[PDB]
Amino acid sequence: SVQQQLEALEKSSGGRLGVALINTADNSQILYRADERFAMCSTSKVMAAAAVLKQSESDKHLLNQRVEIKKSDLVNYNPIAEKHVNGTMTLAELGAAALQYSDNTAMNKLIAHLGGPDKVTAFARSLGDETFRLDRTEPTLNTAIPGDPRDTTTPLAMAQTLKNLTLGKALAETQRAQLVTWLKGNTTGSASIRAGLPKSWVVGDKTGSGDYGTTNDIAVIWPENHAPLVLVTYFTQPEQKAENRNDILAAAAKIVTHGF
């Protein structure tokens, strides 16, 4: 009947909804189209940030390395990087900006530092994620064309990988804690998953949006008196210029967490 509710939400919305919830208390799962590919858009930024944190495990100087920001580095959405044109940002600062403000220049800097989109994909494979693929940089990784496999993953794969990154064995403790700190400080997710949950729950999330009204959020959730939940909600539509629908993600989160 959670299934019935998600199916009715999807039908009314006129799009395609993908949901994966992992309850880490018993490793039970609520899945809806969790095996289907969706364009990740900005939710892919988490993997690029994590790949740099993994590097920092063996290179104690990495996170403080400075990167020059020039006018030509700027793409189409740079709320943090534009404040530093002609100056520099550390890799840690780029990580923060990519995740907490969804800065596109910060994402591209991280990808260039790693050596390209294929390097983010190899990082994901090393974590046992055989689904994730990053193919392009910002801003073209957001085209989200139906049936296009580029820059996609599935809700289940992303839920498992986010669990491993934030609560599991993917990163050493210091790096794991840094990633979690970044996600909890996200500024862009108020109208998404967070809006469907009790106000007192602690949430770390990364949103993403793109063409075809593609509207995504992935979250780690710490309830007050229970083990954490991991929740991925992906949503996309059939018209290229469809409006983004953060309210659909909030509604889906309310449905699947009804019971906690």
Curated annotation (Swiss-Prot):
Q: Does the keyword Repeat apply?
A: no
Q: Which residues bind substrate?
A: 206-208
Which Gene3D superfamilies does its entry note? DD-peptidase/beta-lactamase superfamily
Q: Does the keyword Amino-acid biosynthesis apply?
A: no
Which keywords belong to this entry? Antibiotic resistance, Hydrolase, Plasmid, Signal
Q: What is its EC number?
A: 3.5.2.6
Q: Where is the active site?
A: 42 (acyl-ester intermediate)
- Show the GO MF annotations: beta-lactamase activity
Q: Write out the catalysed reaction.
A: a beta-lactam + H2O = a substituted beta-amino acid
According to its UniProt entry, the protein's GO biological process terms are: beta-lactam antibiotic catabolic process; response to antibiotic
Tell me the superkingdom of the source: Bacteria
Report further notes: The class A beta-lactamase family has a specific amino-acid numbering system, sometimes called Ambler or ABL numbering and often misspelt as Amber. A multiple sequence alignment was used to derive a consensus sequence and then the consensus was numbered taking into account insertions and deletions. This allows use of identical numbers, e.g. for active site residues, despite differences in protein length. UniProt always uses natural numbering of residues, hence there appear to be differences in numbering between this entry and some papers.
Family statement: Belongs to the class-A beta-lactamase family.
The role this protein plays is:
Has strong cefotaxime-hydrolyzing activity.
Q: How does it assemble?
A: Monomer.
Record protein name field: Beta-lactamase Toho-1
Organism field:
Escherichia coli
The organism that produces this protein has a lineage beginning with: Bacteria, Pseudomonadati, Pseudomonadota, Gammaproteobacteria, Enterobacterales
Q: Which gene encodes it?
A: bla
